[PDB]
Paper text:
To confirm that Actinomycetal Orn proteins function as dinucleases, we measured the in vitro and in vivo activities of Orn from Blastococcus (OrnBla) and Nocardioides (OrnNoc). Actinomycetal Orn proteins readily cleaved both the RNA and DNA dinucleotides in vitro. A comparison of their kinetic parameters with those of previously studied Orn homologs from Gammaproteobacteria V. cholerae and P. aeruginosa, OrnVc and OrnPa, respectively, revealed that OrnVc did not distinguish between RNA and DNA dinucleotides and that OrnPa, OrnBla, and OrnNoc had a slight bias toward diribonucleotides. Given that OrnBla and OrnNoc were able to rescue the small-colony phenotype of the P. aeruginosa Δorn strain to the same extent as OrnPa, our results suggest a conserved cellular role for Orn proteins as housekeeping dinucleases. The crystal structure of OrnBla in complex with pGG further confirmed a conserved mode of substrate coordination across the bacterial Orn family, including homologs from Gram-positive species. Structural superposition of OrnBla-pGG and OrnVc-pGG showed that the sugar-phosphate backbones of the substrates aligned perfectly. Neither structure revealed elements in the active sites that would restrict the space for the 2′OH group of the nucleotide's ribose. The residues of the active sites facing the substrate sugars are hydrophilic and can accommodate both deoxyribose and ribose. The only significant structural difference between OrnBla and OrnVc is the additional C-terminal helix of the former, which is far from the active site and has been previously reported to stabilize the dimeric assembly of Orn from M. smegmatis.
Author numbering:
A (entry chain A): 5 to 209
B (entry chain G): 0 to 208
Write the structure that this text describes.
């Protein structure tokens, strides 16, 4: 409960049938978003044919970051990278199905991890904390907060990306969420009873 | 444009023969539309999708039991609706509120699981929805850590594993969080947001250097 696993993946594209996983960065925070270790950033080998298949937008970002040339030199396999990520996570989260996976639009990463790294996929809780869910809520409920987001960076790797995901959530914690510990038990029970009453007729049909 | 975000939210809950994206079948899809303030705009759509007798007999004991007890299995057996037909019905329904593709987030509890089945079986619907999603369970997990009394006060959900009631309870859960763990609208001023952004940028700058 006291730890969050953050992952950002890079791919040759978004297609779960055809595209390859070429980078996995992993970061651990506690439940208060304190970063517990500098993180891991693993560059996974893919063949030149797979890299030649990237579309213009993906080929361009991975060229500008230098990722593609690093992928070409790497000998790390998906199975080797999975064992490295699993051991790293277990230093802080030894028990399986206890820590959620966290990131921006993190379900996309999870799909590639479920396909390529089943042992890691099963070690993480199925629940995830999608920072972009909060982003899109703020976009509608608190538009000035949405437009005030910290600017995210250019031409950097997956590890910098996942750190900026934590920073974005730390920004929302200071702006759109109430102060901890939050409402009292009586206040929470009252709010729950209000929305139960407000949704009762719709639920009854 | 894809920079535009729709003021309406699309909510979907699915039932399946199991969680395996290779082997399991989509057998129920419920769809609900809300405005940004979580007002439900229509009673919702609930589609029972046919699945072969083999797929139903191959359900594991946990899933076979839940879909028997809810009546879903008998409904699936009686249904003649295909996934392609259900997909076109879902699209026509959503487009009454969200006509532009890639503008409305998909919303639910652990909605990435539903999205994987939609991407596999309903590619046109998958493309019409924004890739971004509002996972109410992400807020639930934040409440567990930052607001535990709100976490323990969540309204009790039904255990029926039926798609329309369950997606309505997902909206109700987010409405609960809106009143408990989110600040009052309109929220921070521009100046307050700038200060908070500067604080976290300063806080993470060395790590990102
Ligand atoms: Na990402
Ligand atoms: Na990235
Ligand atoms: Na569900």
């Amino acid at each position: 409960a006291g730890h969050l696993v953050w992952i950002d993946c890079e791919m040759t594209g978004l297609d779960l049938v055809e595209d390859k996983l070429i980078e996995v960065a992993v970061l651990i925070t506690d439940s208060e978003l304190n970063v517990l270790d500098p993180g891991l950033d693993l560059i996974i080998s893919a063949d030149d044919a797979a890299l030649d298949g990237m579309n213009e937008v993906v080929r361009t970002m991975h060229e500008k970051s230098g990722l593609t040339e690093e992928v070409r030199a790497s000998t790390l396999t998906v199975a080797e990278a999975e064992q490295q990520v699993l051991a790293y996570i277990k230093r802080w989260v030894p028990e399986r199905r206890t820590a959620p996976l966290c990131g921006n639009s993190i379900g996309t990463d999870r799909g590639f991890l479920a396909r390529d790294m089943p042992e890691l996929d099963d070690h993480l809780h199925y629940r995830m904390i999608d920072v972009s869910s909060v982003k899109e809520l703020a976009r509608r409920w608190f538009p000035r907060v949405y437009f005030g987001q910290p600017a995210k960076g250019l031409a950097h790797r997956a590890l910098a990306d996942i750190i900026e995901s934590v920073r974005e959530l730390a920004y929302y914690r200071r702006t759109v969420f109430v102060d901890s510990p939050g409402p009292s038990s009586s206040q929470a029970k009252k709010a729950a009873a209000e929305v139960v009453g407000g949704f009762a007729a719709l639920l009854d049909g």
